[PDB]
Design a protein around this nucleic acid. Structure first.
Ligand code: MG
Ligand code: MG
Ligand code: MG
Ligand code: MG
Ligand code: MG
Ligand code: MG
Ligand code: MG
Ligand code: MG
Ligand code: MG
Ligand code: MG
Ligand code: MG
Ligand code: MG
Ligand code: MG
Ligand code: MG
Ligand code: MG
Ligand code: MG
Lengths: 177, 188, 260
RNA sequence: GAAACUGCGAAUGGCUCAUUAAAUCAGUUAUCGUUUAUUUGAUAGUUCCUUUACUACAUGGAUAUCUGUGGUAAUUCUAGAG
RNA sequence: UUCAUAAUAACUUUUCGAAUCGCAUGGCCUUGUGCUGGCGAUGGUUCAUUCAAAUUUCUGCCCUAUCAACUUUCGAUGGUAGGAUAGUGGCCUACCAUGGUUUCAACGGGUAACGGGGAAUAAGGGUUCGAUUCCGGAGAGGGAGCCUGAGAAACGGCUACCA
């Protein structure tokens, strides 16, 4: 089934389709938050290792963390929980949700790559996705720079330039605190 | 869901009132605290108009006051020995208001020792002159000395742990204590 | 209803706002403020209706927003502000100053009153209490809480707030033979002198009032507002001074004073 | 100035008369028997705890919006990553 | 009034006591980013006031006796203590007392009964109507249960059963 792999440090990710019944066999009976070696999921995944963080059932129901069940169940979710977003304040809703144990009923497996392996993936182990925007709070910028705090962080704010086609203009965030 | 409205009760005459309206929210009643002893565990409850209330189930220590010389000290509740409403709470060690409990009684003891120094159960010149000015006026009655020798004081709680969350009360003393010993001797 | 009510249908508005029973389904509900809504007067009513300076709701909103209304020396930019009895409304445009006092028909009449006296205001003492740290304080009918009052100021008494600093300037002690105003019931707008104040142990004090025309009535003490000493009112009484001419006397006034 | 977070209202208004015969309601009282966002008027030095070593010229981490990957036939369904 | 308030002893899984925004940015010269400094906007503890909300006293309701006794083991009336309540209160629990209403119609039954301000009718007395333009109450298919908030047992809010 579909596997959504995500490398955090490169900040990249991809979707991979697998049809063989045996590469996914190791994913069976493995709950969210566990680690599975990359040798047993693909001969191109040598050295790799997969943290399992959520997924989607064949009916589209996501798997909630800490359900420890290989089936679906109806749960009364509220604010703070996953698999639900409340519209009104304190609006509890009873919704279906897949259990945290991975079984054959799954359709997408959300997987983090943790350890860099031997054979490199196309654009995940190689390419890096830049951060879309930098820090905003003053001390956050200082920490992101290691700026020896008493150094007038005023100027060191990043400044993104965009060209309208006729005018090049700068846009930089306002520093809070 | 526990209502406290008067509608469900019969009329003074005795007629069975028909249901006028489904019970409201400003008439609600919540579960009893039925507090216990040990491992302090107070749960906040958000009541009408904010105004946090504190359920004080499983409370071990609290403030207790002595009326004669009027001094308050934090001390441990050690079991309940009498309850004027239901002895079942006594058997289950459920602590509610007006219950009668025993006190570790040490803090009162060395407060007395550092305050009068009469060596119950059987220095700087300033302290000596204070004691001389006191002139052995600490003639507190005999029964409290008896349980001081025993080591456990007899206190009656006065705070409501169900609402306040605290565990405050006052020692039985004077004729008060007398009365309850009679009742306790009825238990004995 | 489950919670506060925020709409005032037109017929349910007090008959002293005395609006038009047609031309509208609702009436301006006064927002929470210094006066009871039954006794108060929204600024929109005072401007659109009493003064006709505006024409409708938008005009009153524009008037209040640009900070030309000053209720007791403060702006009060909300349309339904409850400008109640004895409040002062200042318009720097037209440099005009009004004080709300009932005309003897019993209505909030438009009383153009001078700038010099517009500096201060009168108030009735509704409570005298001791707040935290043993600090005496006095609560007037506006809800103004004046701290550190004169030690012999008592309840039902009257005070003269300077309305600039908001402190106590002078006060009048309630007792017999004293000029007085009425603020409720059939005797709205009536002005007289206290002849007797029967106690009635257990509640609901009553006072007897005799006016200049030598007519006599009786009114509740909650309903009473001492206004000064006889012959020397502490404010400028409205036209007619609240004598409550009889209907036949009013007809004779219409017939006699008549020029067209 | 979209979106989203935050705040506030959504308990007002509108409709109907099914239930209800000391029930509702009306007039008249009481709350020295209580909660009260808001509006209005006032309202606080002590947060030091042994004060002869602290950020007060400003303390920390997430988090939506967004960038991208999806799932379900579909619902104001939303899981993973930054 | 055990009130307002004050004071002593203590207590707290220690609430608040501005690390927030806009405009104008003046004065002092200790002439530096130095010292101060106005008008507001949001907050914020407490006490008042207002919008209120809950209860609450007396009196008042249509027909029916082919409804004369009704209520209490399951609260019926009261006592005490506790629990819960925002708060009084059999509102609930524990233990006691056996009490409360009734021929001045209680209790039960009926209402093609929501109550009222009012409408028709009109010598006077009255008779009938009042679902509906205002005030109250109740309800969102029938039932229960609840989160958020100051305020809901909310339903153009959720949970479950029944249809
Ligand atoms: Mg309504
Ligand atoms: Mg009946
Ligand atoms: Mg007191
Ligand atoms: Mg009681
Ligand atoms: Mg009717
Ligand atoms: Mg009906
Ligand atoms: Mg009707
Ligand atoms: Mg009908
Ligand atoms: Mg209505
Ligand atoms: Mg409803
Ligand atoms: Mg229907
Ligand atoms: Mg709110
Ligand atoms: Mg409902
Ligand atoms: Mg609807
Ligand atoms: Mg509605
Ligand atoms: Mg909803």
């Amino acid at each position: 089934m579909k596997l959504n792999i995500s490398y955090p440090i490169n900040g990249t990710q991809k979707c991979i389709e697998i049809d063989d019944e045996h590469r996914v066999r190791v994913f069976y009976d493995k709950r969210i938050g566990q680690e599975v070696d990359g040798e047993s999921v693909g001969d191109e995944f040598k050295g790799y290792v997969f943290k399992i963080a959520g997924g989607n059932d064949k009916q589209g129901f996501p798997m909630k963390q800490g359900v420890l069940l290989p089936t679906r169940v109806k749960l009364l979710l509220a604010k703070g929980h996953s698999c639900y977003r409340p519209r009104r304040n304190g609006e509890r809703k009873r919704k279906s949700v897949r259990g945290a144990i991975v079984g054959p009923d799954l359709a997408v497996l959300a997987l983090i790559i943790t350890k860099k392996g031997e054979q490199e993936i196309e654009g995940i182990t190689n390419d890096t996705v830049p951060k879309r925007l930098g820090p905003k709070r003053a001390n956050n910028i200082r920490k992101f720079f290691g700026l020896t705090k008493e150094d007038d962080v005023r100027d060191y704010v990043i400044r993104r330039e965009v060209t309208k086609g006729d005018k090049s203009y700068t846009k930089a965030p306002k520093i809070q605190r | 869901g526990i209502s406290r409205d008067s509608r469900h009760k019969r009329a003074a005459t005795g007629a069975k009132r028909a249901q006028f309206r489904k019970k409201r929210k400003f008439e609600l009643g919540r579960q009893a605290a039925n507090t216990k002893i040990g491992t302090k565990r107070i749960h906040p409850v958000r009541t009408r108009g904010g105004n946090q209330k504190f359920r004080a189930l499983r409370i071990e220590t609290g403030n207790f006051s002595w009326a004669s010389e009027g001094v308050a000290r934090k001390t441990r509740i050690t079991g309940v020995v009498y309850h004027p409403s239901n002895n079942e709470l006594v058997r289950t060690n459920t602590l509610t208001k007006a219950a009668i409990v025993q006190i570790d009684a040490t803090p009162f003891r060395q407060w007395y020792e550092s305050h009068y120094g009469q060596s119950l159960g059987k220095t700087s010149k300033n302290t000596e002159r204070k004691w001389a000015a006191r002139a052995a006026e600490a003639k507190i009655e005999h029964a409290v000395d008896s349980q001081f020798g025993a080591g456990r004081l007899y206190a009656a709680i006065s705070s409501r742990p169900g609402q306040s969350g605290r565990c405050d009360g006052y020692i039985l003393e004077g004729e008060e204590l007398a009365f309850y010993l009679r009742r306790l001797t009825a238990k004995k | 209803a489950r919670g506060p009510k925020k709409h005032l249908k037109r017929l349910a508005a007090p008959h002293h706002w005395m609006l038009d029973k047609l031309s509208g389904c609702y009436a301006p509900r006064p927002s929470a403020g210094p006066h009871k809504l039954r006794e108060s007067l929204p600024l929109i009513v005072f401007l659109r209706n009493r003064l006709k300076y505006a024409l409708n709701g938008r005009e009153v909103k524009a008037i209040l927003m640009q900070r030309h209304v000053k209720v007791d020396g403060k702006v009060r930019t909300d349309t339904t502000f409850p400008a109640g009895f004895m409040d002062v409304i200042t318009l720097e445009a037209t440099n005009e100053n009004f004080r709300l006092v009932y005309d003897v028909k019993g209505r909030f009449a438009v009383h153009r009153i001078t700038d010099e006296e517009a500096s201060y205001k009168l108030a009735k003492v509704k409570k005298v209490q001791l707040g935290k740290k043993g600090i005496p304080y006095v609560v007037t009918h506006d809800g103004r809480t004046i701290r550190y009052p004169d030690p012999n100021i008592k309840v039902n008494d009257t005070v003269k707030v300077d309305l600039a600093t908001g402190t106590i300037t002078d006060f009048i002690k309630f007792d017999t033979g004293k000029l007085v105003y009425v603020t409720g019931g059939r005797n709205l707008g009536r002005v007289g002198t206290i002849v007797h104040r029967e106690r009635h142990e257990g509640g609901f004090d009553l006072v007897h009032i005799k006016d200049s025309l030598e007519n006599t009535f009786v009114t509740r003490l909650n309903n009473v507002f001492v206004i000064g000493e006889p012959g020397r009112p502490w404010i400028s009484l409205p036209k007619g001074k609240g004598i409550k001419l009889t209907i036949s006397e009013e007809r004779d006034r219409r017939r006699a004073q008549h020029g067209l």
